[PDB]
Amino acid sequence: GAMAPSYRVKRMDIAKNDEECVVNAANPRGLPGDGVCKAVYKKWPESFKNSATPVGTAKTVMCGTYPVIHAVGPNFSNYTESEGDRELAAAYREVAKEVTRLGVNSVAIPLLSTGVYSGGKDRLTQSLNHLFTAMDSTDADVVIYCRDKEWEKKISEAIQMRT
Ligand SMILES: [Cl-]
Ligand SMILES: [Cl-]
Ligand SMILES: [Cl-]
């Protein structure tokens, strides 16, 4: 575990993370995809061998010894708000299990279902609160990666508000 487990947020490409493993905002079919998923495919393409996994689940594949945790959030274009909310919470619970199993001291994580899978809605708070629900009982240092300047400020505020 980390000596004083923390949450942090950085505004940069999660492919450049400084953590012991990465969570991919994966599609169910293990395809290169778009956004975070394409950056992850360019950086760790070896991790997409047999990475396909259903919605609401996480599947880890090693790139050398570097673990890539493929977490499949729901696409809110296809799911009802209710069912999508349940699957988005479940994906993060499976990320917490994998992070624990791997014995890492740190993890780089994007906000699942907030980009192309958002169904055109702002899901920062929804996705971040499910991240916290899952990760709060883990002792890894969590570093959240985002690309938007206003999202960085809002994520930072939410982290600092609970300290
Ligand atoms: Cl960058
Ligand atoms: Cl997304
Ligand atoms: Cl963002």
Could you give the CA distance from residue 141 to residue 132 in angstroms, rounded to a whole number? 12
**Å from CA of 12 to ligand 1 middle:** 4
Ligand approaching nearest to the C-alpha of 9: 3
Could you please report the per-residue DSSP string of 38-90? HHHHHH-GGGGTT----TT-EEEEEETTEEEEEE----TTTS-HHHHHHHHHH
Q: Are 129 and 162 within 8 A, CB to CB?
A: no
Q: Where are the domains of the chain?
A: 1-163
> What is the chain's length?
163
Q: Are strands 58-63 and 66-71 parallel, antiparallel or unpaired?
A: antiparallel
Q: Which residues contact 110 (CB under 8 A, 6 or more apart)?
A: 14, 23, 24, 25, 36, 144, 145, 146
Greatest distance between any 2 Cα atoms in the chain: 41
Phi, psi of 50 (to 5 degrees): 55, 40
Q: Binding site: which residues?
A: 13, 27, 35, 115-117
Could you give the CA distance from residue 122 to residue 120 in angstroms, rounded to a whole number? 7
Ligand 2 being an ion, which residues bring their Cβ within 5 A of it? 115, 117
CB atoms within 10 A of CB 156: 17
Q: How was this entry determined?
A: X-ray
Ligand approaching nearest to the C-alpha of 71: 2
Q: Binding site for ADP-D-ribose: which residues?
A: 13, 27, 35, 115-117
Could you give the CA distance from residue 51 to residue 143 in angstroms, rounded to a whole number? 23
| Radius of gyration of the chain measured on its C-alpha atoms | 14
Angle at 139 between CA 154 and CA 56, to 5 degrees: 65
Could you give the CA distance from residue 57 to residue 154 in angstroms, rounded to a whole number? 27
CB atoms within 10 A of CB 129: 14
Chain Cα centroid distance, residue 44: 15
Q: Are 153 and 18 within 8 A, CB to CB?
A: no
Please list the helix, strand and coil fractions of the chain in percent, rounded to the nearest 5, in that order. Answer: 40, 20, 40
DSSP state of 112: T
Q: What is the resolution of this structure in A?
A: 1.4
Provide the angle, in degrees to the nearest 10, between the axes of the packed helices 124-135 and 81-102: 40
Residue with tokens 């791997």: 102
Closest alpha carbon to 44 in 15, 12, 73: 15
Ligand approaching nearest to the C-alpha of 74: 2
Closest alpha carbon to 145 in 156, 137, 135: 156
